[PDB]
Ligand binder design. Structure first.
Ligand SMILES: CCCCCCCCCCCCCCCCCC(=O)OC[C@H](COP(=O)([O-])OCC(O)COP(=O)([O-])OC[C@@H](COC(=O)CCCCCCCCCCCCCCCCC)OC(=O)CCCCCCCCCCCCCCCCC)OC(=O)CCCCCCCCCCCCCCCCC
Ligand SMILES: CCCCCCCCCCCCCCCCCC(=O)OC[C@H](COP(=O)([O-])OCC(O)COP(=O)([O-])OC[C@@H](COC(=O)CCCCCCCCCCCCCCCCC)OC(=O)CCCCCCCCCCCCCCCCC)OC(=O)CCCCCCCCCCCCCCCCC
Ligand SMILES: CCCCCCCCCCCCCCCCCC(=O)OC[C@H](COP(=O)([O-])OCC(O)COP(=O)([O-])OC[C@@H](COC(=O)CCCCCCCCCCCCCCCCC)OC(=O)CCCCCCCCCCCCCCCCC)OC(=O)CCCCCCCCCCCCCCCCC
Ligand SMILES: CCCCCCCCCCCCCCCCCC(=O)OC[C@H](COP(=O)([O-])OCC(O)COP(=O)([O-])OC[C@@H](COC(=O)CCCCCCCCCCCCCCCCC)OC(=O)CCCCCCCCCCCCCCCCC)OC(=O)CCCCCCCCCCCCCCCCC
Ligand code: HEA
Ligand code: HEA
Ligand SMILES: CCCCCCCCCCCCCCCCCC(=O)OC[C@H](COP(=O)(O)OCCN)OC(=O)CCCCCCCCCCCCCCCCC
Ligand SMILES: CCCCCCCCCCCCCCCCCC(=O)OC[C@H](COP(=O)(O)OCCN)OC(=O)CCCCCCCCCCCCCCCCC
Ligand code: CUA
Ligand SMILES: [Ca+2]
Ligand SMILES: [Cu+2]
Ligand SMILES: [Mg+2]
Lengths: 346, 206, 53, 50, 671, 50
């Protein structure tokens, strides 16, 4: 009627089942405003700590490259004090703090909001462990894919901002700050300048968000026997599960990010065609099929782990605290649990 | 000769970097081509420097060479293979020829069908449950509580339960704590479950 | 995969003969790589293990 | 388990296994003491209950 | 030419027709053992998925009390449980080992152009589908197919023939036909349905309740279908209560995979239907087995290469185990056939073989079945030991430890398992003299199993280890077997067996054995012969995921079942006390983890063919380093191969500097 | 205890006492029953019956 395809609306009759629970019921708190608010709050807080840690570590490396590393506790204390008062450190903290606000609000918040939207209604089994977690896999996969490319425009803007500072005055844009660079790049180089050859970031974000949210949600319920039967410390178990979740996220995410080094940084054989033709996707496929894992796992900690994992770990803890991973559990033999009360005691 | 089939001339052919240096169309069946041999000057010098006091080998300074991809498995030639296997019924003697080229070699073919193989557990389970609606059509549907006093009072018993909770006995039982609080409210002709009941509202009667 | 080494040995009759060291498998002809090229990869796949019976 | 996982890999310390054939003759009898004790314990406890 | 496009199409039709003949000749009409084995493996995957689906139905029903899945259909659950057991035993493990592996490997390991009976080998494969369908779909199929809300009263009156019986007499005796026609017509050639709803309408003295779809004969006359559409789901009324019966006939059930009498062999309890199909299908499977081992055993005896005619030691352990199991099947198959045939006679002819009233022996049925029953499970497991015995020496570059003793260890288990069939009948009421003999021999069986375990452990020491995915599966197989056998030895404890009989402890015991050990060995062989089967190397990534998830699922799925068994949960019960919610949810979770492992396995095969890369033997042509010269030759080539594989990545110095100076994001410059 | 069955084989199971008696039709199996404590025990049949 309105166009070539017609969305036919149809009515149906009443249908009900013996049990009204353990299926999909949308929680009242699962709303666009509430989910977005919680996701943004958790992401911003996690991002601020992550970027502050990254700035501190890199400033320490910068200072150590010109001065001997600490020899004892006293030397370590003065070394940290000098790093804190470094002029470069203060500027880095300010700029990266802005980067954290943008990333935590548009990328981590979007991931959490989408995850809550697609996975709030999966009820768990009363007095038991949630089975049929396979049903949640499509939801988490859908959320991960949908929110995967929400960080590339900011990350490329960050790289462009920092890469501009190192050019001569004639060739320097002169960005006032990260926010100014982000607001100017779209109108100067064009929107596609913030998305060209974004495969390494997109796949990295997908493998980070999917295996972090899903593994934590799965582990937080399946491993609950530790503090439900073993009387172990619930918070300690959750911290351990979060630690496992972030470590796996880093392991599954770093190899795809190594494509940047192989394609661009590895020296090129004179006269021979590029091993990967300058295509990151082909390099990722090569990494996927490579026999030796250690070859592309090198530099995992010195390059990527401490820049991403601390942020992911905090995000899970913050998300759990606010209640993004909280599911509804009700007795299936209760009043609302089932529609057949004649066999709940007989 | 056709330039459309030549990767060098036709730029629309997407080269596979993972198959560089391997041409399945050039295989022999039986494969009788040597593509590996002693390789030096990469990390171990080909010349002699065992007793050269003024020369010391530094293997860390390895120059980068062309990537060597793993050998690609042979790809079938439909017309050639079908003719090779083809035998004339009542015109060919039943025998095996001396030549070893008559051996029937296995060559990998289209990969599309293997996508269904990878998804077979999903496809099979979907057919078993969703397509056949096993064990019933309601198990996999999103659960909805029955409407108010539907289908009959003997089964639903919403009104009587509502009165029982609102009665003196019901309040006392809730005070004891053995009986949980009421989970639905009887509105003006409709039953509405509280948001804490953790259940969807009953489907409309139409 | 055809021969893993070779040597030249003078037999008791004074003639020099070539001796080749075949590649071997652990009791399993299925794992044995039947090939006719100086290549380690298992390229040839045979439907009839014994072509001539 | 610790020894195999630490030294028996090709990288660390492979060993040239020159032995052609096994020569055990009574290792089975010696090893079967442990399961034999298991059977004795099962029989003893079971019978006392019976 | 004016029909150039048509000519190209004509070539396409010729290509398709030629391809059709090529496929039929090469994959349908072929007698090649390798192709038959590959077809066997694909059939096994389909049956394995069917068995997995049946297992999922069982776990979902057992997830929590109240029958969330079958909703009170106790009979339907029992049929599904029996289908799961029979399909997995006779149509998953058996086709994989004796259908795919035996056909693919025996010619390699005996030196034969083909099996002694290429026709029988092809026949055995193409006969499997019917048996699989019969034993797998019983859960769906019932003699009472219609649901509880189908108004059969709208169709049965049409089927009734006694209504017109009065006309039958006059169709042959015309003398009084005219007098009969002169009677009063009441319900001749007419249907009247009594009121189904209370109606108070004084206006009308009669009401019509004919089915709506049967209202008009103008459309029914030319429709070539039975009058079931009228009665098929034409009423909105439903009752969603567990206590509401879904099947009117309470006898439409199955007696499990053990065929316990008189429940299995009397129509009063297990009425005609699925039970009878299982009885005949079992006889059908036995005859299929008769063709299987007859072809393979004669192939070894008549076509084995010179020098391996009688030296069982030289052959690989998988082949040794397969032949021993085939001999066991031949010895035990007739016993099962006779017992199953007697069950058929009792149900239909009422021969009263198992009726105590007039000399029948109900316990005789259990004796005959378990006499074949226990050797069957031993037949399933013995081939599994072969995979580890071949893989470990291959990757360890070392001879297997005490191959002769391991061969005799399995043999003693094979022919001593014929005197322990009664440990499944301790509580039936047999004489203590027989009871003690079964217990005493059963515990003694533990010793040869321990011999293999120590030999397996000793094969991993003092060698050159080459870690590979098949090796990892072998370690998982070893870990599962240790717990599996140990639990079984406890079941030999007579006092404990009294409490643990027909409980989930036994269910846990043999799932760790069959699902745990046998499947891990099967997957271990699949990765060991992946190049020989598919012609391309497997993908290690999805292979590792399959190993971790499949192994993890089996432990999580079946370890809690031991806790349930100790608690005291019986078997074959779909609704249980609330106190078992916690562990059943764990058991269901483990099954889904195992299913995720299965998903990875299929993704591994799909990914491998996408990679389509030629495989390279790990031994490099030197399986054994019997002399230092051989070791040097391997080292020289191994280092050269590693250099070639590393020829395309930057050196250590370049990689380190790139990693060290990767960070390029700073604020101030100019030094 | 004399255990028997009317129609088919059943199992008189009491996990608390660890007693499992198979009630087989046509048999009059005799068992010894001795509870050495004052207690209340439940049970469920442990043999497929229908
Ligand atoms: C929600 C769905 C959930 C489903 C769950 C399913 C779960 C099970 C399966 C899971 C696995 C699925 C795998 C799918 C196949 C992947 C194949 C692959 O790897 O190669 C593809 C492609 C390979 O391309 P290539 O030729 O090799 O180029 C290599 C270069 O490195 C990189 O290529 P490039 O540099 O040449 O191009 C980069 C790409 C960058 O594109 C993006 O960043 C956009 C996201 C999609 C990119 C996907 C690639 C392009 C595909 C074709 C066009 C897509 C259009 C957009 C998406 C909808 C249609 C799919 O640029 C473009 O295509 C054009 C960009 C245009 C400029 C930016 C403008 C953006 C829009 C702004 C206005 C509108 C929005 C705001 C205003 C709203 C109104 C108020 O790789 C990728 O782009 C990334 C693949 C990563 C795979 C890992 C899994 C993550 C997948 C994320 C994709 C989807 C993101 C969300 C959008 C869709 C849902 C809303
Ligand atoms: C339970 C056993 C009972 C039987 C005992 C029998 C006798 C003793 C065992 C036999 C000897 C095995 C020796 C293994 C260690 C080898 C040396 C070493 O450090 O490894 C690095 C070595 C790579 O070093 P490279 O050659 O210098 O690398 C250079 C290139 O990158 C080339 O590298 P690539 O191309 O090969 O790629 C390597 C890449 C690809 O490889 C992988 O990712 C391997 C994936 C294996 C998955 C299965 C393991 C369990 C996964 C976790 C499940 C949760 C529960 C675990 C605990 C309970 C169950 C065991 O992996 C990595 O990135 C490194 C892997 C992590 C190394 C772990 C370091 C400690 C090893 C010592 C034993 C650890 C035991 C504790 C449990 C396992 C901890 C990992 O990795 C290997 O060769 C692969 C094996 C790695 C260890 C896993 C295998 C042993 C565990 C078997 C468990 C069987 C049950 C499985 C089902 C479980 C279900 C819950
Ligand atoms: C149920 C029972 C389960 C039993 C089995 C599991 C238990 C362990 C079994 C025995 C094996 C482990 C013991 C031996 C090795 C121990 C590690 C070691 O010596 O290597 C050090 C190595 C560190 O680097 P590096 O080797 O010293 O190199 C330094 C170079 O200067 C610069 O480095 P680079 O950038 O050049 O990169 C070098 C990196 C090159 O890159 C790689 O090789 C990385 C990829 C390695 C393979 C990954 C797959 C295999 C492992 C997972 C699957 C099996 C385990 C399953 C566990 C189940 C849960 C119990 O090299 C390596 O890391 C390779 C060697 C060590 C890792 C692989 C072999 C050991 C297995 C993994 C141990 C760690 C497990 C963590 C939890 C796992 C949860 C699933 O690894 C670590 O330290 C990582 C583990 C500790 C992470 C702690 C933080 C995690 C949470 C994030 C927190 C974020 C901040 C917030 C803090 C909040 C606090 C309140
Ligand atoms: C942007 C978002 C993404 C959108 C996705 C859109 C597409 C759907 C998703 C597909 C999956 C994509 C993800 C990547 C997976 C990786 C594989 C892949 O796709 O790589 C590219 C793949 C490359 O193909 P390849 O297998 O590597 O080799 C092709 C070269 O031509 C080989 O050269 P050659 O000369 O050596 O061989 C010539 C011919 C050799 O000819 C033969 O061997 C003839 C075989 C005997 C005669 C019967 C053939 C027709 C029946 C199918 C086979 C049935 C038996 C197997 C049972 C399972 C069948 C699924 O090769 C074949 O074998 C071709 C037939 C392959 C049959 C296997 C199944 C194909 C369908 C795959 C699933 C998607 C469709 C689902 C619905 C339909 C399912 C059937 O190219 C494609 O994109 C093809 C897509 C699949 C075929 C089209 C299906 C359309 C169905 C529409 C309805 C029917 C209309 C036509 C019937 C007549 C009018 C009524
Ligand atoms: C592959 C299948 C398979 C295998 C190999 C076995 C092997 C054994 N089985 Fe089992 N069994 C079944 C499948 C199997 N069984 C099935 C399906 C049923 C039920 C059928 C039905 O009713 O439907 C059953 C039932 C069953 C019962 C009846 C329980 C009951 O009904 O009450 C008994 C009783 O003793 C038993 C004993 C054994 C013994 C002693 C072994 C021995 O072969 C095991 C010998 C090995 C060992 C004993 C291992 C020694 C251990 C180590 C070396 C490790 C030690 C380490 C530690 C202790 C840490 N089995
Ligand atoms: C080989 C035999 C076998 C296997 C593998 C299994 C596997 C499983 N079984 Fe079963 N089971 C039995 C044989 C088997 N079972 C028998 C004989 C009974 C007794 C019945 C009775 O007494 O009535 C029984 C009973 C039984 C019960 C008792 C029900 C009741 O009494 O009420 C339960 C309950 O959960 C159960 C669950 C499972 C689960 C979750 C698996 C999981 O392990 C399933 C996961 C799937 C697989 C393990 C196979 C997947 C296959 C492939 C992926 C294809 C592979 C193909 C190639 C490698 C080429 N089984
Ligand atoms: C090893 C593989 C099997 C693994 C175990 C699977 C067990 C369940 C059967 C699923 C089989 C297909 C795989 C789908 C997995 C993801 C979806 C899923 O698990 O669905 C479950 C869920 C509904 O279940 P739920 O309501 O939670 O059950 C309790 C209610 N009281 O539903 C949802 O969450 C909604 C999902 C919507 C999309 C599902 C698409 C499935 C398609 C399957 C293939 C269909 C093939 C059809 C072929 C037709 C040919 C003509
Ligand atoms: C759940 C069973 C099904 C899953 C597979 C089981 C495989 C078993 C293999 C044997 C080795 C593992 C240990 C046994 C399983 C875990 C413990 C368990 O089953 O929980 C029961 C136990 C408490 O039980 P109980 O003492 O009877 O409590 C009575 C309360 N009135 O609980 C406790 O005391 C808590 C102990 C938890 C230990 C978990 C170890 C395995 C998980 C992976 C490693 C986790 C490492 C980090 C642990 C952090 C703990 C703070
Ligand atoms: Cu009576 Cu089971
Ligand atoms: Ca239940
Ligand atoms: Cu047995
Ligand atoms: Mg019993």
């Amino acid at each position: 009627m309105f166009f070539e395809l017609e969305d036919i609306k149809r009515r149906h009759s009443l249908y009900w089942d013996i049990y009204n629970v353990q299926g999909w019921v949308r929680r009242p708190d699962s709303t666009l405003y509430n989910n977005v608010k919680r996701g943004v709050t958790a992401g911003v807080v996690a991002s601020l700590v992550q970027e502050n840690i990254t700035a501190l570590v890199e400033n320490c490396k910068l200072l150590a490259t010109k001065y001997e590393k600490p020899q004892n506790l006293r030397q370590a204390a003065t070394f940290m004090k000098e790093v804190f008062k470094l002029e470069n450190y203060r500027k880095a903290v300010w700029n990266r703090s802005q980067y954290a606000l943008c990333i935590g609000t548009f990328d981590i918040g979007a991931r959490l909001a989408t995850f809550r939207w697609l996975n709030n209604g999966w009820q768990r089994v009363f007095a038991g462990f949630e089975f049929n977690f396979v049903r949640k896999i499509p939801t988490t996969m859908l959320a991960a894919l949908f929110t995967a490319p929400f960080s590339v425009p900011f990350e490329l803007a960050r790289m462009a901002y920092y890469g501009d500072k190192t050019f001569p005055k004639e060739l320097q844009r002169g960005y006032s700050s990260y926010l100014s660079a982000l607001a100017r790049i779209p109108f100067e180089e064009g929107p596609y300048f913030l998305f060209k050859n974004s495969f390494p970031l997109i796949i990295r974000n997908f493998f980070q968000t999917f295996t972090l949210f899903y593994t934590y949600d799965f582990l937080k319920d399946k491993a609950s026997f530790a503090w439900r039967v073993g009387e172990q410390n619930e918070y300690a178990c959750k911290m351990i599960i979060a630690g496992i979740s972030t470590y796996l996220a880093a392991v599954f995410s770093y190899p795809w990010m190594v494509t940047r080094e192989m394609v661009d940084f590895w020296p090129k054989v004179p006269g021979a065609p590029c091993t990967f033709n300058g295509n990151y996707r082909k390099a990722a496929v090569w990494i996927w099929y490579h026999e030796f894992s250690g070859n592309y796992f090198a530099g995992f900690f010195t390059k990527y782990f401490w820049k991403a994992s601390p942020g992911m770990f905090l995000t899970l803890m913050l998300a759990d605290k606010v209640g993004l991973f909280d599911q509804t559990t009700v007795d299936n033999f209760g009043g609302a649990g089932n529609n057949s009360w004649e066999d709940t005691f007989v | 000769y056709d330039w459309r089939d030549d990767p060098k001339v036709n730029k629309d052919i997407e080269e596979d970097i993972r198959d560089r240096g391997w041409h399945p169309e050039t295989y022999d069946f039986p494969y009788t081509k040597k593509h590996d041999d002693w390789v030096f000057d990469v990390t171990m010098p080909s010349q002699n420097y065992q007793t050269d006091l003024t020369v010391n080998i530094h293997p860390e300074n390895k120059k980068m060479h062309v990537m060597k991809q793993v050998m690609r498995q042979s790809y079938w030639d439909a017309e050639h293979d079908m003719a090779h296997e083809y035998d004339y019924e009542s015109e060919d003697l039943d025998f095996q020829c001396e030549s070893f080229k008559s051996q029937h070699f296995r060559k990998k073919g289209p990969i599309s069908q293997y996508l269904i193989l990878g998804l077979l557990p999903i496809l099979y389970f979907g057919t078993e449950f969703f397509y056949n609606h096993y064990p019933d059509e309601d198990y996999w549907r999103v659960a909805h509580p029955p409407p108010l006093d539907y289908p009959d009072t003997d089964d639903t018993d919403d009104t009587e339960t509502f009165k029982d909770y609102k009665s003196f006995t019901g309040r006392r039982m809730v005070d004891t704590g053995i009986v949980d609080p009421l989970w639905y409210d009887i509105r003006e002709g409709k039953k509405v479950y509280y948001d804490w009941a953790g259940v969807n509202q009953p489907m409309e009667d139409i | 995969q055809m021969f893993v080494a070779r040597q030249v040995v003078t037999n008791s009759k004074g003639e020099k003969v070539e001796v080749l060291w075949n590649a071997q498998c652990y009791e399993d002809i299925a794992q044995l790589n039947v090939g006719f090229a100086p290549v380690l990869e298992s390229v040839d796949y045979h439907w009839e293990i014994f072509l001539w019976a | 388990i610790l020894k195999v996982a630490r030294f028996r890999v090709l990288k660390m310390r492979p060993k040239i296994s020159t032995s052609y054939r096994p020569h055990g003759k009574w290792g089975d009898f010696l090893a079967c003491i442990i399961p034999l004790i298991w059977c004795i314990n099962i029989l003893t406890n079971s019978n006392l209950i019976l | 030419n004016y029909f150039y496009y048509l000519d190209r199409i004509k070539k396409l039709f010729t290509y398709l027709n030629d391809l059709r003949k090529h496929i039929l000749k090469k994959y349908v009409y072929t007698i090649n053992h390798k192709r038959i084995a590959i077809n066997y493996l694909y059939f096994s995957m389909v049956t394995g998925l069917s068995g997995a689906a049946l297992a999922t139905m069982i776990r979902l029903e057992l997830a929590h009390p109240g029958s969330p899945f079958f909703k009170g259909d106790s009979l339907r659950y029992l049929q599904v449980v029996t289908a799961h057991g029979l399909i997995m035993v006779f149509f998953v493990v058996v086709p994989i080992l004796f259908g795919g592996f035996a056909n693919f490997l025996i010619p390699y390991h005996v030196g034969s152009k083909d099996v002694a009976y290429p026709r029988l080998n092809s026949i055995g494969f193409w006969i499997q589908p019917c048996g699989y369908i019969l034993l797998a779909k019983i859960g769906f199929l019932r003699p009472q197919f219609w649901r509880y809300y189908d108004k059969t009263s709208f169709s049965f009156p049409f089927l009734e023939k006694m209504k017109y019986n009065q006309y039958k007499e006059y169709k042959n005796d015309y003398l009084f036909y005219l007098d009969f026609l002169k009677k009063e017509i009441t319900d001749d050639h007419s249907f009247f349905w009594k009121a189904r709803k209370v109606i108070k309408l004084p206006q009308y003295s009669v009401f019509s309740f004919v089915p709506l779809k049967l209202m008009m004969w103008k459309t029914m006359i030319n429709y070539p279908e039975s009058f079931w559409y009228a009665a098929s789901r034409v009423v909105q009324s439903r009752r969603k209560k567990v206590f509401v019966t879904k099947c009117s006939a309470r006898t439409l059930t199955t007696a499990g995979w053990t065929f316990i009498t008189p429940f299995s062999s009397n129509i009063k309890y297990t009425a005609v239907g699925s039970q009878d199909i299982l009885i005949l299908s079992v006889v059908f499977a036995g005859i299929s087995t008769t063709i299987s081992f007859t072809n393979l055993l004669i192939t070894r005896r008549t076509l084995a290469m010179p020098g391996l005619r009688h030296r069982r030691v030289l052959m690989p352990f998988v082949t040794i185990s397969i032949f021993l199991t085939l001999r066991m099947l031949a010895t035990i198959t007739p016993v099962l056939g006779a017992a199953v045939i007697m069950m058929a006679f009792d149900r239909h002819w009422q021969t009263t073989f198992f009726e105590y009233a007039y000399g029948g022996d109900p316990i005789l049925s259990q004796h005959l079945f378990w006499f074949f029953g226990h050797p069957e499970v031993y037949v399933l497991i013995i081939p599994t030991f072969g995979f580890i015995n071949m893989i470990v020496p291959h990757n360890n570059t070392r001879r297997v430890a005490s191959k002769h003793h391991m061969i005799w260890a399995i043999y003693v288990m094979a022919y001593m398992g014929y005197l322990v069939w009664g440990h499944h009948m301790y509580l039936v009421g047999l004489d203590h003299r027989s009871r003690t003999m079964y217990s005493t021999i059963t515990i003694m069986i533990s010793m040869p199993a321990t011999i293999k375990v120590v030999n397996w452990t000793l094969s991993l020491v003092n060698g050159a280890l080459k870690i590979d995915l098949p090796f990892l599966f072998s370690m998982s197989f070893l870990l599962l077997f240790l717990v599996a056998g140990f639990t079984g030895m406890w079941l030999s404890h007579v006092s404990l067996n009294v409490s643990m009989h027909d409980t989930f402890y036994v269910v846990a015991h043999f799932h760790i054995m069959l699902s745990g050990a046998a499947m891990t060995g099967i997957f271990s062989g699949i990765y060991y012969y992946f190049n020989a089967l598919f012609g391309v190397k497997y993908s290690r990534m999805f292979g590792y995921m399959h190993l971790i998830y499949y192994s993890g699922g089996q432990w999580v799925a079946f370890v809690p079942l031991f806790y349930l068994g100790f608690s005291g949960m019986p078997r074959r019960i779909h609704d249980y006390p609330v106190v078992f919610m916690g562990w059943h949810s764990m058991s269901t979770t483990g099954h889904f983890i195992t299913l995720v492992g299965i998903i990875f396995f299929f993704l591994m095969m799909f990914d491998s063919h996408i990679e389509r890369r030629a495989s390279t033997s790990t031994t490099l042509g030197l399986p054994r380093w019997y002399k230092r010269i051989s070791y040097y030759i391997f080292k020289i080539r191994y280092l050269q191969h590693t250099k070639s594989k590393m020829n395309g990545i930057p050196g250590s110095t370049v990689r380190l500097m790139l990693i060290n100076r990767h960070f390029v994001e700073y604020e101030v410059y100019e030094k | 205890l004399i255990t028997n069955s009317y129609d088919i084989v059943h199992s008189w199971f009491i996990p608390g006492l660890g007693i499992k008696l198979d009630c087989v039709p046509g048999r009059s199996t005799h068992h010894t029953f001795f509870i050495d404590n004052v207690g209340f025990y439940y049970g469920q049949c442990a043999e497929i019956c229908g």
